[PDB]
């Protein structure tokens, strides 16, 4: 569509494209550096995009867009969190749940996206 590259799905991509915090390929920000070949976003934007597509009434377009975005190999987002110590559950090559050292200050880190 105009925003994803018919109306409800298009509006999900619009909002996602206006994410306030993005990091281009090779960009350094927040003490991180994006080593992927495409832009990565804050996890809250990716979270809201995922939920928007899942709840969209244009269910067929949303299904294609969600799968395309989220199920690409090695997809990640960043956010501020206590230092990550491990993964509690992995499925299909993705961390579902992680653990942290709650006693150390929060720092920006990288997190797996969920499969759609």
């Amino acid at each position, epitope marked *: 569509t105009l925003w994803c590259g018919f109306k409800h799905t298009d509006a999900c991509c619009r909002t996602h494209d*206006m994410c306030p915090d993005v990091m281009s390929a090779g960009e350094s920000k927040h003490g991180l550096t994006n080593t992927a070949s*495409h832009t990565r976003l804050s996890c809250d934007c990716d979270d809201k995009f995922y939920d928007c597509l899942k709840n969209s009434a244009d269910t067929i377009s949303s299904y294609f867009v969600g799968k395309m975005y989220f199920n690409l190999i090695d997809t990640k987002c960043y956010k501020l969190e206590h230092p990550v110590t491990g993964c509690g559950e992995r499925t299909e090559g993705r961390c579902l749940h992680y653990t942290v050292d709650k006693s150390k200050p929060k720092v920006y880190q990288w997190f797996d996206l969920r499969k759609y």
Partner: nanobody, 117 residues
Framework: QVQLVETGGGLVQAGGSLRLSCATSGTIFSRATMAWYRQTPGKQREWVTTITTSGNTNYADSVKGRFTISRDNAESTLYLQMNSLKPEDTAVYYC???????????WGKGTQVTVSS
């Protein structure tokens, strides 16, 4: 189709300034996240600066305070104002248009900047 055309490159003495321009197809511009990259001689392409659709910016450490990215959506043009140029800034500069949901990237063919000492 999409077209990204950089201009404004050239030769300048160290301590001088240049302003690069990247004119795009107006169809897309206000929607795109925009960035400048550069390729210094004998190196890979590296990120310099990003500007979001709302105009918020981030810069590489080596250009902070010297370079300014800006966008004029009405003119479908991205700018890079380069002040206090140094010979280490010699490079081909490329503009990049990004669509976040489709993970689409468009690139200009780049403009040469040479900073003599």
């Amino acid at each position: 189709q999409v077209q990204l055309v950089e201009t404004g490159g050239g030769l300048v003495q160290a301590g001088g300034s240049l302003r690069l321009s990247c004119a795009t197809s107006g169809t897309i511009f206000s929607r795109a996240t925009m960035a400048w990259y550069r390729q210094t001689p004998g190196k890979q392409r590296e990120w310099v600066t990003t500007i979001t659709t709302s105009g918020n910016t981030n810069y590489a450490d080596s250009v902070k305070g010297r370079f300014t990215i800006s966008r004029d959506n009405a003119e479908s043009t991205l700018y890079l104002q380069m002040n206090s140029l140094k010979p280490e800034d010699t490079a081909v500069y490329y503009c990049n248009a990004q669509f976040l949901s489709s993970r689409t990237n468009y690139w200009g063919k780049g403009t040469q900047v040479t900073v003599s000492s």
